[PDB]
Amino acid sequence: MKYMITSKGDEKSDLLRLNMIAGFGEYDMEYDDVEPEIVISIGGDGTFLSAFHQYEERLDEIAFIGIHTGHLGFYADWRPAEADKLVKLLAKGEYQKVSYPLLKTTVKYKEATYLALNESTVKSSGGPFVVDVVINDIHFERFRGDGLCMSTPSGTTAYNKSLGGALMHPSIEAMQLTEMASINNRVYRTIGSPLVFPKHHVVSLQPVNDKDFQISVDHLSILHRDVQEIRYEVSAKKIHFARFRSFPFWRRVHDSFIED
Amino acid sequence: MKYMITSKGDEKSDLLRLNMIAGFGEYDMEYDDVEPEIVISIGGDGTFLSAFHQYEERLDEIAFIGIHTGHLGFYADWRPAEADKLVKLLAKGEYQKVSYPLLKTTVKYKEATYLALNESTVKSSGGPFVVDVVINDIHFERFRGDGLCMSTPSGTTAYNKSLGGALMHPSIEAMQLTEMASINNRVYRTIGSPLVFPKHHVVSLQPVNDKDFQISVDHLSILHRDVQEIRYEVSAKKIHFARFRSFPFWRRVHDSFIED
């Protein structure tokens, strides 16, 4: 089975990568970073993010594995000392697949589309941030403030969390929108609360004056000029994980935030 | 078709109720508050809550209608001046059904079960509130504070909202747990963020010292003594609404909180 391995780049991660490759050499496993069926990421959640985007064009043909070298990561839930056990199980195909929902972002000017594993956020180019929020073609509110964040289920433990958003189990096909320092006057009104949308619901952000926005997708952040619309919806695409043992999302949340 | 009508009790509501009954008299409609197929609530969301609990034993045989007399209610989304149009459509059966998820609460000592349309909350009898939160048999945290609130999707716009919870579209089969003034020390740790659970996930609250709790279910609030466990899960039962026109949840949220 074709596979590839990305690395954080530091000494610890590269040597672990080299050892796993040597181990894979003792099995019927072909290293291939062009069309792998298995992508192993060694490092943190930031390394896993990169691995995901590196292969976002063939998400349906890939099963991802995360190794943390590293504090306990949400995506990288494998200890380094378990690497040898890992190469074994991967070789004999003793694993099933677990899928998480993704977020689709469409920027219309032409138009560009992006896929997020964590979230996509929108900010202004420097001036004040003012946008109209439209839900399924119905004007919901005019948001004034620092920006808006639209998170996937697995992304709720990231940026979303810092903004007061709720943590959602990744078996729920939804996206969550949170506010960033909204102005609430006797003249300016936002909902304040995070909003959780189901599949097929479309949230559209529309410029009021300034048409330039700094739009981020996970770790990537690009300036978009002359934007007519930003469109959010639960993607039809999903990310597939290879799971060899039980590591429940809530236990992962506990170990990362409460006590490990 | 059998039907019944509850009223807020004030002059406006009772007279509207009497007029609708007279109108139903002009059709093949039998008033029956023992086995109605249609329950019409005239008043506010508090009146609708009562109507729901009054008939929670036959939820699968009933379609609910809410009339607000009344500011725009989340459950009571019919204007009084539309009552005559309402009686018409109900008579000719020109309506489909919309269902919302419900919350099941199980209190073990024996055990009692309750059904919530909005939420179920837990507080102490007076002393400090300390409970262990267990998710699917795994200890998640030890909560210290004022209490915990477990909300249905449609209930997220109620008490849940005041506690910083997210608003969830009621087509999502989930429950949301929020904290009430949790103590977060260098010794006491809670997740802080709201938690959204899917169907079949079980959240269990377990006493640490005091075994007495003030437990609320929607408008009802009873003291429970010698509690061994409080168990939350998305109910297998659902509430059924009769819908005659489009009134989207998000538009309802907008009209109630942003601008009507």
Place this chain on the structure above:
Amino acid sequence: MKYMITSKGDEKSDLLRLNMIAGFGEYDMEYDDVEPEIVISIGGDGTFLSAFHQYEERLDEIAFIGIHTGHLGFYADWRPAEADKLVKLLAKGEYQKVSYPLLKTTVKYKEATYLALNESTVKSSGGPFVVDVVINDIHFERFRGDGLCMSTPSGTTAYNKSLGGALMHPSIEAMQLTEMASINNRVYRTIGSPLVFPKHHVVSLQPVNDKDFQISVDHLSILHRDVQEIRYEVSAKKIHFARFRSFPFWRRVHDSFIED
């Protein structure tokens, strides 16, 4: 110099108390719990609270000392192993005084007055909590929700903190009001933000319907019936601490919440 010692009641605290008394016996120190000039509290912040209220009638003649036996307390900032050094310094009068502001609460029906070291809160007797907030005789808002909390500066690290309140340096003569799960509709409006008031500002809570309130003052909580007004203001009275070394408030905040 007259002195007295209160104890948490457990083995550790009582024996420490007995040892300190024996140590004081080696100096010109008279034990007196009726008119002490020095009150030593051994236990936690809950024990210190009790010591304070036990002697709130002679606050200007007393210097308080807190010993934690015990995690690091905000009021009890002395390690048990430092007790012997403590008895020494207290005997030779090698200490200056540090004062913190207090909160005065006046309940009118007749009227009762209370003094708080941490905070005073107001809740309903069971029904909904609705009160008019009047600042210096000007109606500020009508609050609907679970309740209101008025905190002293040193109390801001307590209940106030759990409600989203700010931490205030105790050299600032002020009181801070925070909300408890306020309902914010398109019909019900509260400020949302905590409010910090200076000396001589008077905040008055006035019933709208229900005249019965559960009113707490620090650890004490009594039901008041037929209340006409609750009045908050920075007290003219202050609590006096005896300080032998530098232990800055912000360092105390750090050790309690960040890392000790």
Place this chain on the structure above:
Amino acid sequence: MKYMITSKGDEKSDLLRLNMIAGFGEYDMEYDDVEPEIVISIGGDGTFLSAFHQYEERLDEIAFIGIHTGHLGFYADWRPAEADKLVKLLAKGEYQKVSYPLLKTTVKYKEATYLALNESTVKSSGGPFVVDVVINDIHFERFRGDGLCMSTPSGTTAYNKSLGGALMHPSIEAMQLTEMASINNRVYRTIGSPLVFPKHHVVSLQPVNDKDFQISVDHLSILHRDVQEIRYEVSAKKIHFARFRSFPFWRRVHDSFIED
């Protein structure tokens, strides 16, 4: 008495400015925008901000007046239709002075100092924002997130408010620090709560890796490279308002946020 008038620039504001000048011509009043004793700002709070910074070098020789043309502003608390009454009172010197505290910001690389009427905030140049917070020379925390905001008392109703900060009466000489989307892990810890500092307390932000910061002061925002320290403290300088009638801060808060 020397005076000057700034304007929002729109038709309404300029004509009001021209009329007031004509009115001042009927009295012993000399227009002078180089050394005015009275600065009148016509527009919004953004116009008042500009007027303040335009003359921040002679704050002790100036009394500011704000006219809103305009919704009710916090600094611009004069209705346009009251302009004629205003010119009268100003001419006869029938006014006393009210002073609000200011915030001093010192950026060391050399060093630059800035004065804020509302707040000063710090963000990263694009990468992650990581800084060490030092209070009076004692390391308090390592902040990871979007940024930090340090607000004056009168500024608490602005940006500070959107970040969950408390509203402080401007008679209190203090500054308030609030967080912007802080990361709180089991490895990263911030206080979370807003912090209110008194006069003479110094808060210092120190780079951990990236030494470049986008630093804002009210409406102004400049990038600073190779920063060694950002230092916050309550300024010795104060802004002076000319007051002709009672318009209490809390009433101003009410009219702006609750109901006008």
